[PDB]
Amino acid sequence: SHMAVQIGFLLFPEVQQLDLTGPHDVLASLPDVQVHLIWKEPGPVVASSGLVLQATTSFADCPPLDVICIPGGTGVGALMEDPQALAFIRQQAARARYVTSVCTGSLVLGAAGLLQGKRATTHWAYHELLAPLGAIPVHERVVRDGNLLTGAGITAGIDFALTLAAELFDAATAQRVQLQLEYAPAPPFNAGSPDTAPASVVQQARQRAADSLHKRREITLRAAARLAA
Amino acid sequence: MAVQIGFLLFPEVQQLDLTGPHDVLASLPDVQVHLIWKEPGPVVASSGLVLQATTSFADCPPLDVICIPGGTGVGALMEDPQALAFIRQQAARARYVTSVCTGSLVLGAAGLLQGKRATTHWAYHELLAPLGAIPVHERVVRDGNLLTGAGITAGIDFALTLAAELFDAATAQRVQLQLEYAPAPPFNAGSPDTAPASVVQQARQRAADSLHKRREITLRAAARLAA
């Protein structure tokens, strides 16, 4: 309808698609929501896995949003130094009811200046990069600070989106969606956190991330310097 | 030598049934993931999210794994002889025949649940028995080379189970850690067993028209298998 809650996801090249598609299916289950997939122009955008998604609107044509949500992925490093994307995020965040992210999407909120003095989370492997962007780093899976909600790594988007659903509507509505999703997880292993995974698995995870972390640290301090100037 | 994994992408799919497993399995070494429909190109999910089929039935390579997602669109597939024939063709040689949520009703309409333990979404579980399944109230059910997941988000638990079968436990654990899959749901309403009675009543009330229409489709599909 014309009175729909307006929810926008930034959709960028080399996005981690589950960061977007998990929350999308949760939030699209709510009454009279319109969901936008936003990029520089409408059309196909390829996720890091090769899954092809479709942007529905440009930055220019995007209506004022009630909720803005930034997913993460390999493509965040480019977004953290994209003045056009950062200007769009700051413009929308000025009037949004909620300003939100999943996974390394919070590093883009950081680069836009929106984490200064705010509680935030991100993916466990990149959590050290929050503090240089002025955030108070919190090791919790969904973190609220006023109208800022951030989720931790990839699959945290589902917990994040049910939290946001309760704020937009109420606990009863969020619970109904949880039940419709049959979201009673029973993971076959206990390796979802660096605290519970076998030590061998964490060390491998840390080493495989090392070159990405060193590259993102340099981008992060360039982005921090632009907030300082 | 690459493991060939195929998802059936159909109009009015519940996209998370496909996209959850896709991001888990596409994270594995030496896999190639296909999104299959009658022709390549755009296929719109029940939410309005646009996905893109990568291959026609004809161009689909022999699959190691076939996976049928669920959604509003399964009712049409349960009486689509081309889709059912395609699923039987791939199931014949596939190492694993699989589904998530109401995708198991499509496996049932194809004749592939006869005498097998299976699950589906809690609200549609009564439809498994008429399609010949032994209905099991577990979130991921394995019977030989058949794996079925329960409702929508069960696809993530299903896909990690499958990852360990294709590779090993250590490989599945690495992907679980990369996905930070240590769930902390903000409510305890994911099962009819644990949700408040008011929430169950409302979820059953919303599903009622869909369930009645699927009762009718199911009994026509079962009558075809019998004849």
For chain A, the residues before each gap (C–N > 2.5 Å) are none
Whether B49 has its CB under 8 Å from any CB of chain A: the answer is yes
Contact A22 B22 (CB under 8 A): no
Q: What's the gap in Å between the CA of B132 and the closest CA on chain A?
A: 24
**Facing B186 at nearest CB: one of A28, A124, A162:** A162
CA-wise closest residue to B156 among B42, B69, B46:
B69
Query: Is B176 in Cβ contact with A191 (below 8 Å)?
Result: yes
Q: Does A144 touch chain B (CB under 8 A)?
A: no
Centroid of chain to Cα A105: 4
Beta strand extents in B81-183 (DSSP E only): 96-100, 117-118, 134-135, 140-143, 146-149
Strand order in the sheet with A98-102: A57-58, A33-39, A5-10, A67-70, A98-102, A148-151, A142-145
Radius of gyration from C-alpha coordinates of chain A: 17
CB contact B151 to A (< 8 Å)? yes
Query: Are A179 and B198 inside 8 Å of each other by CB?
Result: no
Candidates B34, B173, B210, partner chain A, best to mutate (most A CBs within 10 A) = B173
Q: Is the dihedral of CA A51, A57, A58, A62 positive or negative?
A: negative
Nearest to A79, CA basis, from A152, A149, A7, A13 = A13
Q: Which of A80, A73, A93, A86 is nearest to A8 (CA)?
A: A93
Cβ atoms of residues B48 and A50 within 8 Å:
no
Q: Which of A35, A123, A172 sits opposite B180 (nearest CB)?
A: A123
The first and second tokens of residue A44, run together, are: 């196909």
> Which residues are within 8 A (CB) of A200 and not within 5 positions of it... i.e. 6 or more apart?
B170
- For residue B31, count CB atoms less than 10 angstroms from its CB and return exposed for 0-12, middle for 13-18, buried for 19 or more: middle
Angstrom CA distances, B114 to A70, A115, B96, B122, stand at 45, 56, 16, 20
Kindly tell me the burial class for residue A73, based on how many C-beta atoms sit within 10 Å of its own C-beta (0-12, 13-18, 19 or more).
buried
Residue type, A99: V
CB of A15 within 8 Å of a chain B CB? The answer is no
Largest CA distance in chain A: 53
Q: Do B157 and A200 touch (CB under 8 A)?
A: no
Q: How many residues does chain B have?
A: 227
Spatial separation of the C-alpha atoms in residues A107 and A48, rounded to whole Å: 18
Contact state of A159 with B42 under an 8 Å Cβ cutoff: no
Q: Does A21 touch chain B (CB under 8 A)?
A: yes
In terms of Cα–Cα distance, which of B104, B159, B186, B178 is closest to A183?
B186
A103 catalytic per annotation: yes
Cβ pair A179:B189 closer than 8 A: yes
CA distance B41 to chain A (A): 10
Facing B153 at nearest CB: one of A35, A185, A196 = A185
Query: How many other C-beta atoms are found inside a 10 Å radius of the C-beta of residue B45?
Result: 27
Q: Where are the domains of chain B?
A: 1-227
- A residues 61-90 closer than 8 Å to B (CB): none
Residue type present at position A85: A
Helix (H) or strand (E) holding B224: helix B197-226
Instruction: Kindly name the residue from B97, B100, B101, B222 that is annotated as catalytic.
Output: B101
A chain contacts of residue B202, beta-carbon cutoff 8 Å:
172, 176
B141, B148 contact by CB (below 8 A): yes
- The answer to whether the beta carbons of residues A143 and A150 sit under 8 Å apart is yes
